[PDB]
Amino acid sequence: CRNVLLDPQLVPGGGASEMAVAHALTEKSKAMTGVEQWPYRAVAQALEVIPRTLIQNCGASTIR
Amino acid sequence: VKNAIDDGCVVPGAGAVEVAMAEALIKHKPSVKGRAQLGVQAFADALLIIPKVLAQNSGFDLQE
């Protein structure tokens, strides 16, 4: 209620949200180039470990 | 290909044959006695290794 009352804008996430940012950063690292791209690509991946674990409970090859 | 000349009949494989044969055993007693039945379960699940494990190598869960 404090969330909605502050910002009527909210994410339709569901672990979709961690994932959304993770892929977002990978796209940008490639475009920008520069000395920043390797540390920025490293953090992109860290975020992606988390929604992968949610699929681990469900079954099959998580990464596919 | 020597065998193909020997037999007249060649089946589709890839652990196709083996699930079919295992299914046939689980359902009824082949001799109708309980003495036979204790080895029969054992015989049927032994066969299932060949198909499931092609899935395992590849990275696809075996039960599915």
Curated annotation (Swiss-Prot), chain A:
Binding site for ADP: 14
Positions where Phosphothreonine occurs in the chain: 33, 62
Highest taxon of source: Eukaryota
Protein's cellular compartments: Cytoplasm
Annotated ATP binding sites: 14
Subunit structure, interactors included: Component of the chaperonin-containing T-complex (TRiC), a hexadecamer composed of two identical back-to-back stacked rings enclosing a protein folding chamber. Each ring is made up of eight different subunits: TCP1/CCT1, CCT2, CCT3, CCT4, CCT5, CCT6A/CCT6, CCT7, CCT8. Interacts with PACRG. Interacts with DNAAF4. Interacts with DLEC1.
Disease: Neurodevelopmental disorder with speech or visual impairment and brain hypomyelination: An autosomal dominant disorder characterized by global developmental delay, impaired intellectual development, poor or absent speech, and brain abnormalities including hypomyelination, cerebellar atrophy, and optic nerve atrophy. Some patients have severe visual impairment, dystonic movements, and seizures.
Function according to Swiss-Prot or TrEMBL: Component of the chaperonin-containing T-complex (TRiC), a molecular chaperone complex that assists the folding of actin, tubulin and other proteins upon ATP hydrolysis. The TRiC complex mediates the folding of WRAP53/TCAB1, thereby regulating telomere maintenance. As part of the TRiC complex may play a role in the assembly of BBSome, a complex involved in ciliogenesis regulating transports vesicles to the cilia.
Family: Belongs to the TCP-1 chaperonin family.
Protein name according to UniProt: T-complex protein 1 subunit gamma
Lineage: Eukaryota, Metazoa, Chordata, Craniata, Vertebrata
Gene giving rise to this polypeptide: CCT3
From Swiss-Prot, chain B:
Residues reported in the UniProt entry to bind ATP: 14-15
Localization terms from the record: Cytoplasm
Binding annotation for ADP: 14
Entry similarity comment: Belongs to the TCP-1 chaperonin family.
General function of this protein: Component of the chaperonin-containing T-complex (TRiC), a molecular chaperone complex that assists the folding of actin, tubulin and other proteins upon ATP hydrolysis. The TRiC complex mediates the folding of WRAP53/TCAB1, thereby regulating telomere maintenance.
Quaternary assembly: Component of the chaperonin-containing T-complex (TRiC), a hexadecamer composed of two identical back-to-back stacked rings enclosing a protein folding chamber. Each ring is made up of eight different subunits: TCP1/CCT1, CCT2, CCT3, CCT4, CCT5, CCT6A/CCT6, CCT7, CCT8. Interacts with PACRG.
Related illness: De novo genetic variants in nearly every subunit of the TRiC complex, including CCT6A, have been found in individuals with a broad spectrum of brain malformations, and clinical phenotypes ranging from mild to severe epilepsy, developmental delay, intellectual disability, ataxia, and other features of cerebral malfunction.
Protein name as catalogued: T-complex protein 1 subunit zeta
Annotated organism of origin: Homo sapiens (Human)
Coverage span on the entire protein: 398 to 461 of 531
